[PDB]
């Protein structure tokens, strides 16, 4: 996936050249960023369940009409799919934090997202609200540099939803 | 198909943009064949650097050069030449036998350069590459004008990242799609040998049912109840 | 790509004489029923999102291994690819229905499609199942007697059924 | 002989790009294409078909 | 392959990656409305083919009195017999175009490769233009209405190609 | 591409040696008879339409099946193709006669031509027959004593016949 | 093309699972040895001309048949392609060394290399010998204590050795 | 010129996308590496005279024939050319250090270097020996990671010549 | 190779047409010059040994330092490879005389020449000196148009080296 | 315009190289075949009126139907146009002789031939008969290589017509 190391290697390769000093400094920056990013991944993995259930409840609070019958969020199966989707998003955010790139989000979430949302009439505002709750909670589960990394990736997902 | 970026060159650019564009151009247009320094076209890229020609004009020049002709024309059938030119200049494989008839007749009547211009002046080339981005293999992703055979035939024409379209094969420069385009068959999807170890544990044919060792019969009421 | 008329003309040319009176009667009858044919092609065109949503929902109900991690429709990219392929095959079936011949479908759409899916690791039997479900939804929409003058169109339903079944058989 | 054609893409080109789409990156409106005599007519026909408007044509 | 109204409709929709919209169905409805006069013209031409062939051969002979002379193409029984064969080919491709409501049969059988074959076998396109003008004359005697009009238009396309 | 000189050079280089005096004498003889060779090539070039028309006339006299409906030269498109193939093969035989080596004919014209014809459905036997007819029609022009100095040119006749035979054997 | 991180991510995704504590520990260990990895990659990059030079010298001393007339490195064009191949293999080995995964080699460097060499008639055993000589020359520059902090980098040595062996084994 | 920020902007721009986590990680790595790089630039700037003089002397030691009559090192104009060229190499090396990228060396030295040296019959091995002397003397002048930065840039120049 | 007959046929082939009078006049010129060219090739083949010995001696005379220990010309293997290389150049000059075209020189020496000379650190000036000795010594031989024929190809090789 | 010297220059211009032994030998062939070509041009240009009148009468003989009323030959202006056209063909064959290339014929007659011959109903067989007449006369007005030159260019025009 498109991560710092992979971009480095692929850009150098498509230009038929070795890895220069700039590319190695990018790699060094990635290796330094690994510590806060992996600690943030640890924090979001540890608290995944409360995070996702709170995010689903936040979605239902901002979008009360959804739970009523005849629309998307009525019924146990639909809400279970909701929790599964937000779990997917959180999982891929943690993958991005580990890889230090938007690669996993781009490959697994961002690509083809709008077409799927139109095909199944899934409103992106739902997922944006869930990610906003995740953002608010990771503001209280992390601190310092890890907080900034997690926020970076969550905002990346939000910006690509809107 | 996914990892190498589409290389685009505009009127003003720095040194590294220019050099990388040239590397990508030579690695696509000349197949993946080694072009020696004595073979490198200097005036054409000076005109490209000035802005006299676009990247499209540079492709036109290169496809008219003795490097391109010596590799993909002079020791080939016309079928092989048309396959190569579709792959390297249009990023796809020929879809119909009518395309081969058209291009063979065009070369026979109007010459080689009219053939190259039919490739580069085509609306398909300009739709996908315009004047500034280097041609790339483009039937590995679905596009508004693709056909069922296109993916398979491009896969047949593409020999891997470490493979190339070279006349220096001991068997020569031979057409591989000449029999399949005529019969409207798909291309071959046999990939190289270094890819056998890749993702061995996938089970795409999961729904397929294993047969029983012996078909069950019903002797008394008939043999299919 | 040739229609019913060009098919008749090619068969006549192979033997090398004029179209017989029976052939011309067949083709004139085809042109007379072409209004109903246009109705059928309009039915397929206006209801494509409905047909493909229905088919996708049924397909991922029957086959859950497609939409779950590791499945071939798992991430949005491959899910979008699946729905796109459904759009494409429905499009070519409607083309063939208008043409009155399945030459456009076979020649332009289904010819290297099994080879493509086999190279990509896509279950061709699942694709065939999706085409069958999409045929069923399409046949529900074709038979709709609202907004359109009532009359017999059984030949058209059977013909659309053959086009979908040929697509399924070619993929699988 | 060599002909320099200064073309400025216009709304007729913009509508075509809005329908078809940018398979290639977006570029500025006005630019010049240098063609020989032999290619001159196909170049003009193509620019007309795409909706592009020629600012002028000069010879050299 | 054959440029029939349905075929340009479908190929246009296909090059744009879209379903057949209202305009394409407009065109298709028009073609299906053509098909009554067009099929009647095809039927009339098929029935009256023999007289048309003989008259066309004779009209070519009168318009080119010299060709039948010895040392020239028209001389010989074989040359005139397969003059008649060629005129039959042209007539039934005209019927093909009428049935298909398109120049596709003409463009694909006679028109494509026409000049090179004429040159190689040294056949004057003017002989065939004369035969086609003869059949164009007889069309008014055999056809009427829009059926006449369709047959005349297809013969004119064949002539313009031969021109 | 190889002429006789390049073939000798490649042969000498494979063993990594200078060209022998014998090879130099052979190439000197070739250069000496180059003027007769140029006349032979000009005889082929200057009479190509005649050669091809004669060959096509005889070929379609022998083989009516080609020009019948359903035959492989029936419409003007396939007849034009037949005549074009004849002219291309003759062109390449003239190239080879000039070069003195059939490498150009093998590489460009005959590289994959048998199986291309098989895939198309072309009777390779009839193509070889047409190449034989062009050989026979060309031989008349190669032995035309008018407009040229008189001399022995039997080797050129043999070589041109060998190139025609090579084409006819590679095709079928 | 994957690094170690994206490989772990793909495995976890196949499980449908967040990365485990132990997986994150192994990944943080990889990223903490990162500076030694960078020094090794820089040692490969900076000494590449020396590596290819002494590897080629040893190879053409051992296998003199390669540079004889009729060998596969004889003319300057073949020798230049030989040196380009050695350059490329070393470059992709350094890519793999930075990535920590040998996915770049089989995705890109060796994608069709064996088929290429069999088509060209290159002796793959000589290419394996060349890659082995490049491994031998590389190990001297990797182990060089000069001007970097002293520490244990033996795992990097083993990893580079495995990458070179993978290239050699895929070629031969 | 090819710098870390340059590669960031170019890669994010060709894809028509805003900057993101991987790109800002590379920029962070560059800004972190800046301090040793500017340290090394200051160190090399202070010792340009001694470094260039020693490099010229090292070239003459390694290739004595250069100084003999009829060769390139005979004449004070040619000696001044030599010292001038080595001063150029050192100046562009410090430029590379400051910009944190091989951009200056690439644009001002490497591009056109082969054909220029071929045209004027300048032997690359002379410049390789000069740069090897400078590389040796950076160790006695620099210590830490500044030494490593300087060495990557000097080795880049040497590889470009080799 | 690209000899006169071959660009004749190649141009005709590219243009999709028979051979016209221009093509055959060029071919006639080739067949006319084939006598002095083969006489020259025979003379050079007959004097190959003396030419190679003199060329190697001239190279060592203009570059004495090369034979010094620690240099590329020291030893027996290196001087044997020198004679091997000069025999190569002479052989391909005679081939290009016989073929009446620079094709053999372009395909067996000039293509890949710079890359190879750079990798193995072979000075092109050595080979230019040796080719100038070949030029001088074939001046003594080969009175007439054979002289011009040979000198065109020797100068073509020299220009490729420079 | 397409001559031997023009192709000489154009190939090298495309390849970005100086003219070489190959191209110089082709030009030598051109210069040596100049003298019989110039002699053929002299003979053809001296006898222009007789050739034109004889060719016009040959065409009227081979095609008797042309002269009778309602045809292309009935009319003094039409026959003046006939003489004009045959003189054009003769003049451009002389130009091709002088230029030692079919370029003047290619540019001035062959290009745009069939389209205008079709638009004006000019049967090419008339001009073929006239050119065959010119051929038969040039068989006697010329001897040796000049005869071959004129025959080659007349045959080129003929094959361009059929
Ligand atoms: C993915 C990266 C990549 C690789 C790996 C690659 C390898 C590669 N090597 C090639 C040729 C070659 N490779 C070699 C090298 C071998 N022969 C000698 O015996 C040596 C023992 C040995 C090298 C150590 C030679 C001599 C050729 C030229 C073959 C010929 O011209 O006949 C070619 C054919 C290109 C052409 O000739 O136009 C390719 C594609 N190309 C790539 O883009
Ligand atoms: C790898 C990344 C990935 C994601 C994120 C993803 C989301 C996703 N959710 C889906 C279903 C769904 N998802 C929802 C979510 C809704 N439920 C309501 O309670 C909420 C308001 C709301 C969520 C905030 C619903 C209702 C459906 C069922 C829609 C249907 O009828 O098909 C579907 C359709 C396929 C299926 O039936 O399972 C996709 C593709 N798929 C992926 O491959
Ligand atoms: C014009 C005619 C035409 C068609 C129809 C066509 C189909 C087509 N489908 C593709 C991929 C695909 N197709 C599918 C759909 C299948 N997999 C799912 O499981 C379903 C069971 C099933 C659909 C019901 C999927 C998931 C992919 C992506 C596979 C991958 O990328 O690994 C691809 C590869 C390129 C791409 O990813 O866009 C093509 C070319 N191409 C054509 O030129
Ligand atoms: C924009 C393109 C277009 C459309 C949409 C179109 C529809 C159309 N349908 C018609 C009648 C009809 N339409 C149908 C078709 C229906 N019968 C069953 O209900 C089926 C559900 C369905 C078709 C499968 C039938 C049976 C008739 C009566 C027969 C006839 O008049 O041709 C008519 C003739 C006028 C009339 O009787 O109302 C038109 C013009 N024509 C066009 O040119
Ligand atoms: C697809 C439809 C088609 C057409 C139209 C066609 C015309 C045609 N007529 C031919 C023969 C011929 N055609 C003619 C011309 C006719 N004979 C004279 O009585 C008349 C003056 C004149 C017609 C008005 C002659 C004289 C020949 C035999 C001599 C020769 O072509 O060389 C030939 C050469 C092959 C052969 O039949 O032997 C063609 C291609 N062929 C086709 O496949
Ligand atoms: C540059 C060297 C070269 C050549 C010459 C070549 C031959 C060639 N002949 C072709 C078709 C053809 N070739 C022929 C000619 C044959 N059929 C007739 O019956 C005769 C027996 C015989 C000629 C004497 C015909 C009729 C076709 C059309 C086949 C079809 O449409 O089915 C085609 C396919 C293009 C088309 O359909 O028009 C090629 C490529 N290919 C090459 O790369
Ligand atoms: C511009 C293009 C061009 C052509 C065409 C050309 C031909 C050419 N033919 C020649 C003679 C000749 N031509 C022939 C060939 C003929 N002998 C038999 O009659 C055969 C039927 C026939 C074989 C095709 C022979 C045998 C000679 C005598 C050469 C000799 O005795 O050495 C000569 C020598 C001068 C002379 O005729 O006295 C030339 C230059 N040269 C050119 O520069
Ligand atoms: C067919 C065209 C062709 C040429 C021209 C050619 C030359 C050539 N000479 C070489 C070696 C060599 N050649 C020399 C020549 C030097 N010896 C000294 O006496 C002189 C000053 C000087 C020559 C004038 C030397 C020293 C080497 C060994 C270089 C090394 O091993 O690093 C090499 C490197 C591979 C090997 O060890 O053989 C090549 C490619 N090879 C070819 O395939
Ligand atoms: C500009 C690109 C760049 C590079 C090249 C780079 C290398 C680099 N190498 C380092 C130390 C080191 N370098 C090595 C590697 C060497 N040790 C020897 O034994 C082996 C021969 C060899 C490889 C095993 C080791 C073992 C260390 C100490 C380990 C550590 O720093 O934690 C350090 C940390 C210095 C310290 O904290 O004391 C860096 C930053 N950093 C960068 O930003
Ligand atoms: C420079 C090359 C060139 C050529 C060769 C040429 C021929 C030529 N002749 C023409 C007129 C004509 N040419 C003729 C020739 C006929 N007169 C009869 O006695 C004969 C059967 C026959 C001559 C053998 C006739 C009848 C016309 C007038 C008919 C018409 O314009 O349609 C025309 C139309 C414009 C005009 O001149 O009035 C052209 C283009 N023009 C050129 O620019």
CA distance G84 to G99: 22
Q: Which neighbouring-strand residues pair with D34? A: D4
| The pair of three-digit structure tokens given for residue F164, joined into one six-digit string | 């025609």
Nearest residue on chain G to H150, alpha-carbon basis: G147
Instruction: Identify the residue whose tokens are 């000379």.
Output: I117
Closest ligand by atom to A95 CA: 2
* Residue E144 burial by Cβ neighbours in a 10 Å radius (0-12, 13-18, 19+): middle
Task: Check residue I70 and report its DSSP letter.
Answer: T
Q: Which neighbouring-strand residues pair with D57? A: D5
Experimental method used, please? cryo-EM
Do E and A touch, counting CB pairs below 8 Å (3 needed)? no
Contact C134, C51 (CB under 8 A): yes
Q: Is C13 on the interface with F (CB under 8 A)?
A: yes
Phi-psi region of I121 (alpha: psi -120 to 50; beta: other; left: phi over 0): left
Q: Is J101 on the interface with I (CB under 8 A)?
A: yes
Residue F107 CA: distances (Å) to CA of B57, B221, G36, G135: 30, 70, 54, 41
Do H and I touch, counting CB pairs below 8 Å (3 needed)? yes
Locate all alpha helices (DSSP H) within C63-153, ordered by sequence.
76-99, 103-104, 113-120, 124-142
| CA atoms in the 13 A half-sphere facing the CB of J103 | 13
Contacts of B66 in chain J (CB under 8 A): 14-15
Expressed in angstroms and rounded, the spacing between residue C84 Cα and the centre of ligand 3 is 7
Closest Cα in chain I, distance from residue G165 (Å) = 24
Contact I104, I92 (CB under 8 A): yes
Instruction: Identify the residue whose tokens are 């088929």.
Output: G115
Residue F73's φ and ψ, nearest 5 degrees, are -130, 35
CB contact under 8 A, C53 and A111: no
With contact defined as 3+ CB pairs under 8 Å, the chains touching E are: B, C, F, J
Cβ contacts from F onto J, under 8 A? 14
Closest CA to ligand 7's atom 43: I25
| The pair of three-digit structure tokens given for residue A11, joined into one six-digit string | 């850009």
3-state secondary structure of C148: coil
Residues contacting C98, CB < 8 A, separation 6+: C37, C38, C41, E6, E9, E10, E20, E24, E28
CA distance E46 to E44: 5
CA distance F143 to F123: 31
Residue C109 CA: distances (Å) to CA of B157, C105, G96: 20, 5, 40
| The pair of three-digit structure tokens given for residue F159, joined into one six-digit string | 């070589």
CA distance I72 to I76: 11
Instruction: Identify the residue whose tokens are 């003889």.
Output: F29
Give the angle G125-G81-B134 at the CA atoms, nearest 5°. 125
Q: Which among C56, C75, C78 has CB closest to A119?
A: C56
Contacts of J33 in chain I (CB under 8 A): 25, 28-29
Contacts of G81 in chain B (CB under 8 A): 34
CA distance H93 to G98: 25
Residues contacting B211, CB < 8 A, separation 6+: none
Measuring CA to CA, which residue among A43, A120, A124, A121 is closest to residue A86? Answer: A124
With contact defined as 3+ CB pairs under 8 Å, the chains touching J are: B, E, F, I
CA distance A153 to E159: 70
Contact I119, I15 (CB under 8 A): no
Expressed in angstroms and rounded, the spacing between residue A108 Cα and the centre of ligand 1 is 37
> How far is C-alpha B67 from the chain's CA centre?
18
| The pair of three-digit structure tokens given for residue D48, joined into one six-digit string | 């007309």
Residue C47's φ and ψ, nearest 5 degrees, are -115, 20
Closest CA to ligand 10's atom 16: J82
Beta strand pairing status for D53-59 and D3-8? antiparallel
Concatenated DSSP letters of C22-82:
HHHHHHHHHHHHHHHHHHHHHHHHHTHHHHHHHHHHHHHHH-GGGSSTTSTT-SHHHHHHH
Expressed in angstroms and rounded, the spacing between residue A36 Cα and the centre of ligand 9 is 21
Q: Which among C49, C52, C80 has CB closest to A116?
A: C80
A60, A72, A112, A117: which to mutate for ligand 2, most atoms within 8 A of CB? A72
CA distance F73 to F71: 6
Contact E126, E59 (CB under 8 A): no
Closest Cα in chain C, distance from residue B29 (Å) = 26
Closest Cα in chain C, distance from residue E60 (Å) = 23
Closest CA to ligand 6's atom 11: F81
Contacts of I2 in chain B (CB under 8 A): 66
Residue I27 CA: distances (Å) to CA of A3, D14, F95, H114: 61, 56, 12, 39
Contacts of C17 in chain F (CB under 8 A): 69
Closest Cα in chain C, distance from residue B208 (Å) = 8
Contact C133, C83 (CB under 8 A): no
Closest Cα in chain B, distance from residue H106 (Å) = 8
CB contact under 8 A, F15 and G68: no
Closest ligand by atom to B192 CA: 1
Q: Is C83 on the interface with A (CB under 8 A)?
A: yes
In short, whether B77's Cβ falls inside 6 Å of ligand 6 is yes
CA distance F120 to B98: 12
Closest CA to ligand 4's atom 11: C149
Closest ligand by atom to I75 CA: 8
Contact A19, A9 (CB under 8 A): yes
CA distance F77 to C9: 17
Q: Which neighbouring-strand residues pair with A9? A: none
CA distance D48 to I135: 61
Q: Which atom in ligand 10 lies closest to the alpha carbon of residue J120?
A: 32
Q: Which run of H or E residues covers position D33?
A: strand D30-35
Contact C98, C45 (CB under 8 A): no
Contacts of B44 in chain J (CB under 8 A): 16
Residue D56's φ and ψ, nearest 5 degrees, are -165, 175
Expressed in angstroms and rounded, the spacing between residue J84 Cα and the centre of ligand 10 is 8
Closest CA to ligand 8's atom 38: G67
CA distance G41 to G30: 15
In short, whether I78's Cβ falls inside 6 Å of ligand 8 is yes
Do F and G touch, counting CB pairs below 8 Å (3 needed)? yes
Nearest residue on chain J to E124, alpha-carbon basis: J123
Task: Check residue A70 and report its DSSP letter.
Answer: T
Q: Which atom in ligand 10 lies closest to the alpha carbon of residue J63?
A: 21
Strands of the D3-8 sheet, one edge to the other: D30-35, D3-8, D53-59
Locate all alpha helices (DSSP H) within I63-144, ordered by sequence.
77-99, 103-105, 113-119, 124-140
CA distance C44 to I42: 82
Task: Check residue C112 and report its DSSP letter.
Answer: S
Instruction: Identify the residue whose tokens are 């020609």.
Output: B53
Give chain E's end-to-end CA distance (angstroms, integer).
25
Contact B55, B9 (CB under 8 A): yes
Task: Check residue F20 and report its DSSP letter.
Answer: P
| The pair of three-digit structure tokens given for residue E9, joined into one six-digit string | 């409709």
Measuring CA to CA, which residue among I47, I33, I3, I55 is closest to residue I149? Answer: I33
Measuring CA to CA, which residue among J102, A51, G30 is closest to residue I25? Answer: J102
Beta strand pairing status for D53-59 and D30-35? unpaired
Nearest residue on chain J to I2, alpha-carbon basis: J22
**For chain D, what percentages of helix, strand and coil (3-state, to nearest 5) are there?**
35, 30, 35
In short, whether A122's Cβ falls inside 6 Å of ligand 2 is yes
Closest Cα in chain E, distance from residue C23 (Å) = 10
Cβ contacts from C onto E, under 8 A? 102
Expressed in angstroms and rounded, the spacing between residue H146 Cα and the centre of ligand 9 is 12
CB contact under 8 A, I28 and J27: no
Mutate to test the interface with J, among I13, I25, I94, I146 (most CBs of J within 10 A): I25
Measuring CA to CA, which residue among G69, G59, G41 is closest to residue G133? Answer: G59
Q: Which run of H or E residues covers position F69?
A: none
| The pair of three-digit structure tokens given for residue F88, joined into one six-digit string | 């291309």
Q: Which among C84, C110, C115 has CB closest to B142?
A: C84
């Amino acid at each position: 996936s498109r991560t710092v190391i992979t971009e480095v290697i692929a850009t150098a390769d498509s230009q038929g050249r070795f890895l220069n000093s700039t590319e190695l400094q990018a790699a060094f920056g990635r290796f330094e960023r690994a510590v806060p990013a992996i600690e943030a991944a640890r924090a979001l993995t540890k608290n995944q369940d409360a995070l996702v259930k709170g995010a689903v409840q936040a979605v239902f609070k901002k979008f009360p009409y959804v739970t009523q019958p005849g629309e998307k969020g009525y019924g146990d199966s639909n809400q279970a799919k909701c929790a599964r989707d937000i779990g997917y998003y959180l999982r891929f955010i943690t993958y991005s934090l580990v890889a230090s790139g938007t690669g996993p989000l781009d490959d697994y979430v961002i690509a083809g997202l709008r077409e799927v949302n139109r095909a199944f009439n899934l409103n992106p505002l739902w997922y944006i609200e869930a990610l906003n709750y995740i953002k608010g909670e990771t503001g209280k589960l992390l601190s310092g540099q890890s907080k900034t990394e997690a926020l970076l990736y969550i905002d990346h997902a939000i910006n690509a939803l809107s | 198909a996914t990892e190498n970026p589409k290389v685009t060159l505009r009127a003003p650019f720095t040194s590294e943009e220019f050099q990388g564009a040239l590397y990508a151009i030579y690695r696509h247009i000349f197949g993946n064949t080694y072009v020696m320094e004595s073979e490198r076209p200097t005036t054409a890229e000076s005109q490209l650097k000035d802005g006299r020609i676009t990247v499209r004009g540079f492709i036109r020049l290169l496809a008219k050069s003795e490097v391109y002709k010596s590799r993909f024309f002079q020791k080939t059938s016309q079928n092989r030449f048309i396959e190569l030119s579709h792959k390297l200049l249009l990023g796809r494989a020929p879809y119909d036998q009518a395309e081969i008839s058209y291009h063979l007749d065009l070369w026979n009547t109007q010459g080689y350069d009219a053939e190259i211009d039919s490739y580069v002046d085509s609306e398909e080339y300009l739709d996908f590459f315009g004047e500034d981005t280097v041609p790339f293999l483009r039937d590995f992703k679905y596009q508004t004008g693709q056909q069922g055979v296109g993916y398979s035939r491009l896969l047949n024409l593409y020999d891997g990242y470490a493979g190339s379209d070279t006349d220096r094969a001991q068997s020569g420069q031979k057409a591989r799609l000449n029999g399949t385009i005529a019969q409207a068959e798909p291309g071959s999807i046999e990939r190289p040998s270094a890819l056998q170890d890749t993702w061995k544990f996938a089970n795409p044919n999961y729904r397929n049912a294993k047969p029983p060792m012996v078909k069950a019969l019903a002797l008394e009421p008939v043999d299919l109840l | 790509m040739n229609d019913v008329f060009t098919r008749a003309i090619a068969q006549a040319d192979l033997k090398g004489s004029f179209l017989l009176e029976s052939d011309l009667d067949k083709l004139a009858s085809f042109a007379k029923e072409g209004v109903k044919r246009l109705d059928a092609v309009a039915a397929l065109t206006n209801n494509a999102p409905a047909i493909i949503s229905d088919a996708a929902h049924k397909l991922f109900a029957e086959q859950q291994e497609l939409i779950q991690p590791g499945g071939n429709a798992y991430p949005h990219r491959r899910m979008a690819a699946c729905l796109r392929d459904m759009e494409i095959i429905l499009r070519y079936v409607s083309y063939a229905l208008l043409a009155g011949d399945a030459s456009v479908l076979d020649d332009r759409c289904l010819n290297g499609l099994r080879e493509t899916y086999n190279a990509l690791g896509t279950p061709t039997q699942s694709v065939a199942r999706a085409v069958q479900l999409m045929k069923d939804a399409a046949m529900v929409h074709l038979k709709s007697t609202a907004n359109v003058t009532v009359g017999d169109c059984s030949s058209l339903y059977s013909e659309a059924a053959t086009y979908f079944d040929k697509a399924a058989a070619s993929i699988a | 002989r060599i002909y320099k054609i200064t073309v400025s893409e216009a709304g007729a080109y913009a509508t075509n790009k809005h329908r078809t789409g940018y398979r290639a990156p977006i570029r500025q409106s006005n630019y010049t294409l240098t063609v020989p005599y032999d290619r001159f007519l196909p170049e003009m026909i193509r620019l007309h078909q795409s909706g592009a408007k020629i600012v002028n044509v000069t010879s050299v």
